UniProtKB/TrEMBL annotation, chain B:
<protein>
    <submittedName>
        <fullName>Mitochondrial F1F0 ATP synthase associated 14 kDa protein</fullName>
    </submittedName>
</protein>
Length: 221, 61
């Protein structure tokens, strides 16, 4: 009624069969992160092999697969970078939260796909009111780490984060994106560091904000 | 000239114009195609000992 390794074998046999479609891959990946299965590398390899093998793809399964890849902390550049074609084909049919998850996800792996980041930054600056500021910070993270020095989205994020009071983790992700971009806009960074007072639910985002402010040399907060 | 009343085409010519080609055995198809589908089995089964799935889609460990 509650058993971890038996459900690992159930996911293992669910992913080892020959005709696994993409929805089974996506929820096997999400179920593999929620049980926190960094101890099993072969199971994540089977899930990523079936993710590379799948051809059907909608918004929801692609989004949950990419969310699971980045929450579990698995890295394989081949199957993640071959998931950006499914993104650019499905990009106008994506929700703004779904575009947020896939662009942060394909940016975190370092996928050099300039058409995806151009057509995602054009979407997020064409309809900026659709985007809650965590979605703005995730798209900013993905466009910064994907290797485009996009200052249009950086200026749009500066306007949003100065106008809208944002989360702690949202501001930390925006600081990490601005640190890789190397921009050091004090009008934006001040509006982000003022959000670090409500108590932070994580330590990795405070460490990322410390590394970001060290890379920009503002001062310790 | 009693030999000219006999049929001039020899018995040897009848046996070589009637049994001209060696006939195809019925077991040749089974033997040849089973020897080739043994290689189809060995390469592409997932339970074959020398299967080619780990040489082609290598692994992800």
């Amino acid at each position: 009624e509650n058993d971890v390794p038996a459900i690992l074998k159930e996911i293992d046999s669910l992913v080892s069969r020959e005709a696994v479609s993409a929805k089974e891959v996506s929820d096997a990946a999400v179920a593999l992160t929620y049980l926190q299965v960094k101890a099993n590398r072969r199971l994540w390899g089977k899930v990523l092999e079936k993710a590379g093998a799948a051809q059907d793809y909608d918004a929801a399964s692609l989004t949950n697969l990419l969310w699971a890849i980045n929450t579990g902390g698995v890295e394989h550049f081949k199957t993640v970078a071959e998931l950006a074609g499914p993104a650019v084909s499905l990009l106008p049919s994506l929700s703004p939260v779904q575009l947020s998850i896939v662009v942060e996800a394909l940016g975190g792996a370092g996928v050099k796909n300039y058409e995806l980041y151009n057509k995602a930054s054009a979407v997020v600056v064409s309809k900026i009111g659709e985007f809650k500021p965590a979605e703005i910070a995730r798209v900013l993270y993905g466009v910064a780490f994907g290797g485009v020095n996009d200052v249009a989205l950086a200026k749009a994020a500066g306007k949003v984060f100065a106008s809208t009071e944002v989360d702690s983790r949202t501001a930390a992700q925006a600081l990490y994106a601005l640190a890789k971009l190397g921009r050091a806009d004090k009008a934006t960074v001040d509006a982000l560091l003022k959000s670090f007072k409500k108590g932070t639910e994580s330590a990795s985002d405070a460490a990322a904000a410390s590394f970001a402010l060290g890379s920009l040399s503002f001062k310790a907060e | 000239d009693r030999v000219l009343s006999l049929p001039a085409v020899s018995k040897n010519q009848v046996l070589e114009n009637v049994f001209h080609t060696a006939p195809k055995a019925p077991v040749e198809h089974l033997e040849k195609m089973v020897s080739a589908n043994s290689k189809v089995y060995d390469a592409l089964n997932l339970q074959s000992k020398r299967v080619l799935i780990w040489q082609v889609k290598p692994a992800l460990f």
